[PDB]
Amino acid sequence: EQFEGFVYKTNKNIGNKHDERVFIIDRESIEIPLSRDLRRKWRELITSYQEIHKKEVDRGDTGPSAVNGAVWSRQIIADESERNLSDGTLCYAHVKKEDGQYKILNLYPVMITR
RNA sequence: UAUUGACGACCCCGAUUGGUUCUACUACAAACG
């Protein structure tokens, strides 16, 4: 198939990780209102990612001590610009179907998330 | 469908009262037989 879209390149965050993912915008798409609730949740979650390892990042560790062959995930080393959910920022959305509608629970920077 | 694979310390003082109340001129020598 031929597709187009964007690449959600994070980094080699895990030792078994081989691939980045790219968002096949060429096809089906669904738009959902961005509430202020999801905005604060993102900022709080991304603050958590960036603050938790601040000591490890500042002392110059290239990746988390507990996972070998791996480097900081994009959201951790990214700036506070990442912490603000600005126009065209890429995400994973945690979603379910209810009342016949796609409810969105959270926005997450990675597949298996904090 | 649930796998990948182990490492790692943190806290270092925090909150508050920071003046309160009384004495603020008193007798005199000059006035007045």
- Helix, strand and coil in chain A, % to nearest 5: 25, 20, 55
How were these coordinates obtained?
cryo-EM
Token pair of A6, please?
Answer: 């964007």
Are the CB atoms for A40 and A106 separated by under 8 Å?
no
- Residue A68 CA to B32 C1' — how many Å? 111
Single-letter amino acid, residue A59: R
Resolution as reported, in Å: 2.8
A112 token code pair: 């298996």
Cα distances (Å, whole numbers) of residue A22 to A6, A8, A66: 5, 5, 27
Write the burial class of residue A103 (CB in 10 Å: 0-12 exposed, 13-18 middle, 19+ buried).
exposed
The bridge status of strand A21-24 relative to strand A92-98 is unpaired
d(CA A66, CA A72): 12
| Statement: the CB of A73 is under 7 Å from strand B | no
Tokens at residue A48, please? Answer: 């958590």
Any strand B atom closer than 7 Å to A55 CB: yes
The answer to whether the beta carbons of residues A46 and A109 sit under 8 Å apart is yes
User: Is any atom of strand B within 7 angstroms of residue A56's beta carbon?
Assistant: no
User: Quick check: A53 CB within 7 A of strand B?
Assistant: no
